[PDB]
Design a protein around this nucleic acid. Structure first.
Lengths: 204, 204, 68, 136
RNA sequence: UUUUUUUUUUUUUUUUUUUUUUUUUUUUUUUUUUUUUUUUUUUUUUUUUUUUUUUUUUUUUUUUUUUUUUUUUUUUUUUUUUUUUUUUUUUUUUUUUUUUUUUUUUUUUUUUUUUUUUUUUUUUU
């Protein structure tokens, strides 16, 4: 009965494990990104540099949003690099989660607030809370050589929760789409049938 | 009428029973894990060692989440070991519940907070409360050679209750799925029909 | 007015003001309402499949005089 | 507030302060004493004295950056009157109540949503209900 | 004007239960609207998945048969009164300590008032 044995603290301390976040690309996915990104023209350190470019784009755009964003970085076009991320079966956000802190750190030092701040109607009090990959600010596996401002602050964290509501809302707006059929079964439910009915003028 | 007889305290004290938690794998299930895990390449003490690896993964991942997590441990790949647990008809959490304290103890001594802390939007005040197998911290049958910090603390316990709300929420998000049919009876209710309707802009 | 990339040589009044921002949110409700009024149109067919749903069928029914 | 100073329009200069991510008060806190000193020598009491209903006894206590009068880092070549006086300090505390009140009036606004979630709480819903004529 | 060249069989029931249970012969029409108003208003290009539970516990616990209607208002008064354009964030805590300490089983009701008198007196400056 090996499970009945006492592991002993001396052995527990000898394990020295590492945090294993799932909001970061898998090692093989990181390689998949290399297979695409390096193939795209990036090399060595440019791997991270270009991905940081995308993370900065994700800061102002988002998942496929940053994917659509063009512009040649120090290594290659954002879209090309985004394709590499897609080749790894990851969203740009997945990579951005890992590079969330350095990304925020860059903009924090350059005072470049999120461009979607306005779109999300985020209060000016929470100007720096409109960050899709804000979870990387807390993620122990997230990269970070130095963060100019403690955005992780609990006040900002609750603001990030409010920000999460935004993320949830949009999810309801798009993720909430009812995939009630695959082979075009419009006879069950027509396209755009899930669209909410127009609001009535009455209270009830 | 044997039930009318007095058992006598002298005999009650002679019983010396052991706590029987149901959040731990059954003896035969522990064996089932051996049948898989030992077969997977683990041996003797590695049985617990590898499972501890998974418990550490569960700390940052969860049930099938840690199951999907790869990486070769001192005995075998996490996924392979996870399969052994599945062979025993248990979730990784089931094993983790038993190895919750030593697992937490490892990270507590290494200062490795849960990677899903960010995802769950858990307040920094409760940074170490984001532990799926926190119940093992109180479970009398849970293994533990030495716990660096009394995470069981009542304040943390109420925080764990708040954490339970997270567990409940996600359960509502996934466990709340309406299994209203088996043989694809979409004519009764279409796939993804349970998806909540989009929120209205009005208060009522 | 909040967009960091938006052009601006000089703004006479700080319309970005948080009070105005919440008012802008209320304004967003207007934008949402009209979106519901037009964007909410159900594009349930392309090649004139009126047999599935007739034109202007999405039009809300007339309000009843009763509370229920 | 507009008006071209010896260097540039107040608003333009204010924009510079905003570019630095600071409120004018932030700069004023540093230049609170010299500022007060100017008006103290020119006998120019705060124009918002009336608005704040500050007692005439505390006419010179209606100063938003009064903290700069005590701040050791605040600039000051010479202060005509010791506004820091403890009596004035307690009056400044009373003045702080004004600052707190207005904060409650504006800072107290409930930012319960970002993306216009009026369905949770409608705009201006935080507005206090009208007072009843009864004592209870 | 566009499709074929797209996929199943080899998956499971019968032998499970009712009739013979109840209404008609109960009430409306002959009551009122049209001739009332919009389009020409705005969005897409916004973001998630890869997040977690089961294996947790009850039944076998108790009421009905207890009481009201037949009690009173409308016909009483406001609008036409005033604010915005006023100010904060960027300020600080956690990691501090208790449980395991003691009562119930101690005593009143059934004791007395209303029906007694002022306003219409003076300051601010």
């Amino acid at each position: 009965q090996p499970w009945e044995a006492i592991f002993t603290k001396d052995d527990l301390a000898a394990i020295e494990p590492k945090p294993a976040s799932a909001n970061v690309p898998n090692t093989k996915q990181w390689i998949g990104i290399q297979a695409g990104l390096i193939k795209a023209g990036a090399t060595d350190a440019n791997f991270m540099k270009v991905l940081l470019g995308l993370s900065l784009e994700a800061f102002d755009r988002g998942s496929s949003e940053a994917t659509t964003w063009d512009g040649i970085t120090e290594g290659v076009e954002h879209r090309a690099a985004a394709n590499a991320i897609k080749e790894a079966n990851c969203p740009i956000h997945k990579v951005t989660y890992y590079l969330a802190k350095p990304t925020f750190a860059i903009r924090q030092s350059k005072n470049l607030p999120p461009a979607n701040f306005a779109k999300k109607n985020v209060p000016s009090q929470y100007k720096w809370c409109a960050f899709d990959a804000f979870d990387g600010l807390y993620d122990p596996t997230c990269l970070a050589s130095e963060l100019p401002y403690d955005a992780p602050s609990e006040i900002d964290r609750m603001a990030y929760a409010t920000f999460k509501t935004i993320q949830i809302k949009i999810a309801n707006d798009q993720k909430g789409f009812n995939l009630n059929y695959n082979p075009n079964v419009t006879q069950a439910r027509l396209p755009n049938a899930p669209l909410p009915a127009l609001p009535e003028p009455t209270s009830d």
